[PDB]
Design a protein around this ligand. Sequence first.
Ligand code: NAP
Lengths: 306, 299
Amino acid sequence: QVSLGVVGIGKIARDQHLPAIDAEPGFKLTACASRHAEVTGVRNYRDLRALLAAERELDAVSLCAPPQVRYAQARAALEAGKHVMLEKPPGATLGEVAVLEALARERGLTLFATWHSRCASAVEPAREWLATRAIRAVQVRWKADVRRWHPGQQWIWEPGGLGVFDPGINALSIVTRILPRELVLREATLIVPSDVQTPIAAELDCADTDGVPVRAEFDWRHGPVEQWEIAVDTADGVLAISRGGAQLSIAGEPVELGPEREYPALYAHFHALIARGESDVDVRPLRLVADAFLFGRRVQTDAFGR
Amino acid sequence: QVSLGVVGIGKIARDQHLPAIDAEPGFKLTACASRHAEVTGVRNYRDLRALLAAERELDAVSLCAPPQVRYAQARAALEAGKHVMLEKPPGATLGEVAVLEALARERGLTLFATWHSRCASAVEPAREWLATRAIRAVQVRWKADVRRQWIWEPGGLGVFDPGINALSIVTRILPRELVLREATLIVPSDVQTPIAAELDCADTDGVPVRAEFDWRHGPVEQWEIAVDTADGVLAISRGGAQLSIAGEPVELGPEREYPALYAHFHALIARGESDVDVRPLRLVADAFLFGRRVQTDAF
Ligand SMILES: NC(=O)c1ccc[n+]([C@@H]2O[C@H](COP(=O)([O-])OP(=O)(O)OC[C@H]3O[C@@H](n4cnc5c(N)ncnc54)[C@H](OP(=O)(O)O)[C@@H]3O)[C@@H](O)[C@H]2O)c1
């Protein structure tokens, strides 16, 4: 078993990481680090620094804290000789992820930038069906109530928190996986409430290298049922991904999919990467978001109320 | 020699590119493309597609148009089997540059993303002196008066349009990669790009690298990079033309940024290599992504 530590025991750590780790036989949950939480049955620390100082035989760390502290924690873990798994986004900047990848490669360690939505069951079936066909247009709708997915959370509204791109980048992680050709941003509009620093809604107009238009609408102002949809119009009809990747229809016919197991799949991949002595750092979804911030118009809207 | 075409004959093509090409023996200027300008002594076209269709023996092209039109030109040139040299910045977005580098690598073609300020006289001496030494801190001060439209449009970079030149020097002289830790963009309420900006970086050894860019009226114009080491301060001034080390001024040669660029482009084509350093643009992108934004009075 690979000995594993988890950093930042918050919403996604309780909802997804700890259950997936517990059911993954390749890992032994050995330690956890959190300022305001502890995990029963394992050794607990207030911060990653104290965990690394004490857990010299630990093999790997998985980071579930906000992305603004991701670089500092991942660098420390890599410098201590641990393989590192990163929640999405892999960093607040592209430069820090490049530095981490070079460092992990400069230490022979596994670095894994995870995109949990890429492990949704519809993703690889969609990629396989689309690799052969003539794509005409792509439509993305990724809208959910922020208060239901990040209740009480403030880092989403601070610089490096991405705002609506925090879930929106999941859609881009799927699109960049299922489309055969690279995307380039052509225009973007970011809608930023008067009281925050990140967008609550955004529109993206991209094209792949063949000129296929990729239109995306992200919104955190929404009712209680998510709209997490990607529609690829082809010459053979429409491929429609819905429910964040849990549902797939091709030319109007539903497609049978296995059960959702995104985070089990992530941890299985992390273990396999370590046993292979390989890394997996795809920053293309974050690079497109960076282009959106660099090139995109910014429009003020009314206060969110944080 | 290498047959060469130039696209976008503006003032910098007239002042810098064409004289440098004329004096570079490795190239023969064969054709130029420009919508509103013709170049004496060579064949002339109004767009790159026409040039490419006609100049079938052409080996390479140098693109001097702004980045908003350069990506489509660079694609067509690489697809036509030509080596490509790009003015700075190499793209309007990082995705554009990634596409070109993949395209060039797949056809075995030379792609050269130039940073003309990296060829200023002080840059390579500063890099040699700093390579071995214990650096403590770096400070960049870029200030000027903007009063002396694309710059205020979404994607126009704002103060980073010239400020990225200082970032290309910083990233060349320092021996380790920079990570942006905090940024602040000051945006006039009637524009979409920053008039002033502060960057807070740290290199991979933790060395703080601070940069301030200001386009507003204030104190006297300045362009300075100061790198404090255990052996004293290294100071670059005058956009890279002037160098001081531990208080001692250093003798530098005349400015030949664009002759240097074209000599390197020729050398890249000879060795079959590319040179696509996107890090100065990536740092600017990180500032737009990670930066805190502050509104100021209309411009
Ligand atoms: N919310 C979701 O549904 C979801 C789903 C998939 C992926 N994710 C990703 O997972 C990451 C965290 O998401 P989340 O919803 O779990 O947010 P979160 O609960 O608010 O943050 C997780 C924990 O990180 C710690 N934290 C906050 N600031 C910190 C700081 N400076 N330094 C160290 N620890 C700090 C906190 O634990 P302590 O106070 O105890 O130290 C926090 O409880 C994000 O990158 C997010 O994008 C979220």
